[PDB]
Symmetry: C2
Subunit: 143 residues, 2 copies
């Protein structure tokens, strides 16, 4: 019952009353094509905002310009991952969620996603959100 | 990649009847020796962060203090030189996970990290020599 610890940095990116959501690539997860916030794990020797900027660059492209980044909220969770050989790993995850504002809307998604959208705040509640994203947006009072 | 030691810290802001618990760090150890502080410590592998918080409270403040409300509040990073009892020092890159907390009672037994403790109302906080991290946190809370 192997374990891993992951500190996840997650930007909630706003631009003119719209928030960026990304559609998870079809091969990811149990429910194909749910919408989510971007983000990923901090690497050893990396400051948390450096990790956030790296994740944004990797997933959303280097043309997206951030005008503001600030810590917002955190929580933890656990996930049991089952491997092809049948063994399972418990992943202890700490979510660090940041409020961010972008200057622009230019996004080039990587292989993690199949689509993206700048969603009007009042429209977020109509999207097929993944579980973690639903929890986060509910905390923000956006749903 | 920088070469610093890293640590995730869980930190409770503990209120009881409108007073906040401050602890005075011993003069020869800690990130902020000799100043008044919010407590806190590291998360171990396999521990949920609230379990780590509760463990740290039990170790530093004793088993009799009962936490009746705990909720994530805010986070930030910090870099500080930590002092050890043997006299050596290290620069540590820390993530602070700060929780809003309420205790049922005021029974505290402090460990060797501290040499005093007090339950302090907001109006009186600036009267204490608060460490830099504690001051930033209490400001974010609107108490300062």
């Amino acid at each position: 019952n192997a374990m891993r610890q992951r500190t996840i940095v997650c930007p909630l990116i706003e631009n003119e009353g719209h928030y960026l959501l990304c559609k998870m690539a079809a091969d990811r997860g149990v429910f194909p094509g749910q919408w989510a916030l971007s983000g990923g794990g901090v690497e050893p020797g990396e400051r948390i905002e450096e990790a956030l900027r790296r994740e944004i660059r990797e997933e959303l492209g280097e043309k997206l310009i951030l005008t503001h980044i600030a810590p917002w909220c955190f929580r933890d969770d656990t996930r049991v991952k089952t491997y092809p050989d049948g063994h399972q790993e418990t992943i202890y995850m700490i979510y660090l969620i940041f409020n961010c504002v972008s200057a622009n809307r230019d996004v080039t998604i990587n292989e993690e996603f199949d689509d993206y959208a700048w969603v009007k705040a009042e429209d977020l509640k109509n999207y097929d959100l993944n579980a973690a994203t639903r929890v986060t947006l509910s905390l923000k009072g956006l749903l």
